């Protein structure tokens, strides 16, 4: 079986590392210099706007998946007429547009931050009048990290936010800040028949809006049960096949949906070294029509390497640390690798401090 | 750093799967259709007899290793003048020739089967007269599996064995059969500075001369201590860097060296799923000049897939079984994949019976 992946970044790289031992063959749409290239059979560079050319590429394979949900869902529909794509165009359409995403949650009685579609300055003033500050004006589509957004903290920021962002091609959304205690994510995988394998909750720490640490299992039984119910709902409504990630804000014993990603996700990278079957292997099994692998887990911390990465020789000296370099070059804000460590005992917790020190000296956020 | 591997078979494939997450780049000398191709950066087809061309290929990389010890050790020497090769030409020269291998053990007071260099029919008759039957006449070099050998069980077999094998280019060796109880192997990895990481002993089951099952840890403390001493001796004498495998016959509480392989070995494949750092990751760390990863292990069985492999859909249903298909085509006697399973409990031991049944129905030995 041949699997085509749209995108040749680190998620594609890790999908192939996980899926290749299953005897599956991987091909990416991307560029020669991209980090998945060395671990996939072929890479083909096609502009996504060339729908006919993308479809012709896709027809070479048995199933197609993708690593970036910001892709046109209509392109996905066109491909799916010829070769099965997973997960669904509906999942992409909803997850990729913040307004559609929050509106979908609301329509299903699922809690989110307060939000308003912003299509005029007057609408923004009304949104602030109704839901208050601090808040953020964001592009509905795209806006990777700090891009496509303006944080509104004072009345005088309202007009400034509007003037900066009003011409965004795909519109804007107001979102009120949530005063959460911490953040967690629920990752799961759904097979072709709708059976779901659940990972334990991961607790995620962000710095400057980027995940820097993920720890699993996060053993709060009430939250986990609630998160699992939400996952089941999204899987059904999207007719979802593959790995799905849901990020939450936590307030006391309540969950609030933050956002979803219809793919393997950074907050699941711990599962490479902490679960019997990683989120990557299971995504591959799902889309290949195979039964999912066991997701029994053990305590693991994942530390992200942003901007730069400690020297491999320094990391290797911490002999229980599992190194995941994506073989990228440094650049401020760029995800260049991550480190996983099982936490069983004291030798582990102090190897962890050493990793943190190395990361602190190498990162650029 | 770029690592060149001579050979593009399943061992190279697994070296790259293990080493790529460390941020290392892999290149093979081999053919496009070989199973490592899809997981390495480049593959280059050069006949090994073209020494100048092989050396020119090797100069592109930072370190060179190999997956088949039957390579010319003089070629290795030529390469090593320009770019570091690990492990050593001495390790290759000794391990690849059964007479040199056994002679080396004997010269160091290490036990092996009784053996005689056979360079005439009269010498063979004398060898049988001295050490008896059953025995085997084998080529000193090559002789993969049942190739290059003739089992001698009666007096009348002596002349037949000689007539068949006498023109072997690199000579012959007589070996008396050992009445062993079972077989075990010691795998270890030595770093650039001579520090050794030891794996637990694996107990290996052969069928028709091919390993079909490996189980680790084999918890016999006396044997393990003896095997570790032998490993230390070979590492020192070979100035060895990389993963080394030593196969033994066991008679009671005594070990007898069977043969050695200066590389990752089939009897260590369990370590992909049963050790913190697999024999493959550690080979890569060793030759890259990195400190070795922790080798803490858990009970794991490896089952080999010879000739054919069960359907992936059938294997996937046994959700704790870790699948390692090499993406090869079937052929009698060919190693096409292996399966690993951690044995923690009862759900495991009965998933194991199911794997065995699937393998029994698919294998061709
Ligand atoms: Cl990339
Ligand atoms: Cl091959
Ligand atoms: Na490639
Ligand atoms: Na989303
Ligand atoms: Na390749
Ligand atoms: Na040998």
Rounded-to-integer distance, Cα A249 and Cα A258, Å? 6
Q: At what angle do helices B279-287 and B10-19 cross, to 10 degrees?
A: 70
What's the Cα-to-Cα distance from B183 to each of A227, A333, B96, B246, rounded to whole Å?
50, 53, 20, 11
Same domain, B68 and B113: no
CA–CA gap between residue A167 and residue B105 (Å, rounded): 79
Per the CB < 8 A criterion, the answer to whether A260 and A108 are in contact is no
| Judgement on whether residues B208 and B293 belong to the same structural domain of the protein | yes
Token couple for B264: 């990752």
What is the residue-wise DSSP string for B21-86? GGT-EEEEES-TTSTTGGGSSEEE---TT-HHHHHHHHTTSSEEEES-TTS-HHHHHHHHTTS-BS
Residues A89 and A110 in one domain: no
Indicate if B66 and B119 belong to the same structural domain.
no
Query: Which tokens sit at A326?
Result: 């994506």
| Same domain, yes or no: B172 and B270 | no
Range of the domain at B253: 178-365
Looking at the structure, do residues B59 and B129 belong to the same domain, yes or no? Answer: no
Cross-chain Cβ contact B319/A290 below 8 Å: no
Instruction: Identify which of B351, B363, B249 has the alpha carbon closest to the alpha carbon of residue B304.
Output: B363
Same domain, B113 and B38: no
- DSSP classification of residue A85: B
Whether B18 and B243 have beta carbons less than 8 Å apart is answered as no
| Nearest Cβ partner for A290 among B40, B276, B316 | B316
Q: Which of A153, A177, A201 is the last residue of a domain?
A: A177
Three-state secondary structure call for residue A106: helix
Which residue, B177, B205, B223, sits at the end of a domain? B177
Instruction: Determine phi and psi for B111, rounding to 5 degrees.
Output: -75, 140
**Inter-chain touch B25–A40, beta carbons under 8 Å:** no
Q: Which of B236, B153, B225, B165 is nearest to B196 (CA)?
A: B236
How far CA B304 is from CA of A1, B265, B349, B351, in Å, comes to 22, 12, 17, 16
Contact B38 A40 (CB under 8 A): yes
> Helix A156-165 and helix A121-131: axis angle, to 10°?
140
β-bridge partners, B182: B250
A65 and A141 both lie in a single domain: no
Site of tokens 């290149």: B27
Bridge partner residues of B329 (DSSP): none
Using the beta-carbon criterion (under 8 Å), do B25 and A325 form an inter-chain contact?
Answer: no
Domain count, chain A: 3
Query: Residue A197: closest CA among chain B residues belongs to which residue?
Result: B319
CB pairs below 8 Å between A and B: how many?
Answer: 100
Question: Distance (Å, rounded) from C-alpha A218 to C-alpha A200?
Answer: 7
Distance CA A169, CA A96 (A): 14
CB-based burial, B148-187: b 16+ in 10 Å, e otherwise: bbbebeeeebbeebbeebeebeebbbbbbbeebeebbbbb
Q: Which of B229, B227, B209 is nearest to B218 (CA)?
A: B227
Say yes or no: B146 and B276 in one domain. no
CATH number of the structural domain spanning residue A144: 3.30.1490.20
Quickly list DSSP for B287-318.
Answer: HTTPPPPP--B--EEEEEEES----HHHHHTS
Tell me which of A22, A298, A305 to substitute to probe the interface with B (most B C-beta atoms closer than 10 Å): A22
Q: Measured between CA atoms, how close is B92 to chain A, in angstroms?
A: 28
Q: Write out the two tokens for A20.
A: 């290749």
Which of B125, B111, B82, B75 has the alpha carbon at shortest distance from B96?
B75
CB A113 within 8 A of CB A175: yes
């Amino acid at each position: 079986m041949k699997i085509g992946i749209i995108g040749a970044g680190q998620l594609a790289r890790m999908l192939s590392l996980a899926g290749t031992p299953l005897g599956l063959e991987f091909h990416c749409l991307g560029k020669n210099g991209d980090c998945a290239e060395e671990v996939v059979k072929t890479v083909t560079d096609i502009e996504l706007t060339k729908v006919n050319d993308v479809v012709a590429w896709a027809k070479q394979f048995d199933v197609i998946t993708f690593e970036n949900e910001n892709i046109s869902h209509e392109l996905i529909k066109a491909i799916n007429h010829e070769v099965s794509v997973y997960p669904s165009a509906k999942a992409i359409a909803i997850s990729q547009d913040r307004l559609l995403e929050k509106s979908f949650m609301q329509d299903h009685g699922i809690a989110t931050a307060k939000f308003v579609n912003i299509d005029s300055l007057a609408k923004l003033q009304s949104a602030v009048d109704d839901h208050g500050l601090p808040a953020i004006l964001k592009t509905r589509r795209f806006g990777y990290d700090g891009k496509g957004q303006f944080v509104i903290r004072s009345q005088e920021d309202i007009t400034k936010a509007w003037d900066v962002l009003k011409d965004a091609p795909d519109g804007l959304i107001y979102e009120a800040f949530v005063d959460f205690d911490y953040e967690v994510s629920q990752i799961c995988t759904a097979d072709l028949k709708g059976n779901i394998a659940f990972y334990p909750l991961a607790r995620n720490t962000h710095k400057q809006g980027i995940i820097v640490e993920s720890e699993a299992p996060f053993e709060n039984v009430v939250l986990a049960e609630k998160a699992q119910q939400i996952a089941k709902i999204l899987v059904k409504e999207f007719a979802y096949v593959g790995t799905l990630a849901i990020e939450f804000f936590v307030k006391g014993d309540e969950l609030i949906v933050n956002e979803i990603a219809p793919r393997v996700h950074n907050s699941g990278h711990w599962s490479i070294d902490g679960a019997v079957t990683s989120q990557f292997e299971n995504h591959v099994r799902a889309i290949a029509g195979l039964i999912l692998g066991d997701t029994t887990s053990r305590k693991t911390v994942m530390l992200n390497c942003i901007g730069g990465m400690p020297a491999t020789k320094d990391l290797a000296a911490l002999d229980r640390v599992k190194i995941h370099s994506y073989n990228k070059e440094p650049r401020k804000g760029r995800k260049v690798g991550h480190l996983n460590l099982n936490l069983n005992d004291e030798t582990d917790e102090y190897q962890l401090l050493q990793v943190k020190k190395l990361i602190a000296l190498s990162e650029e956020i």
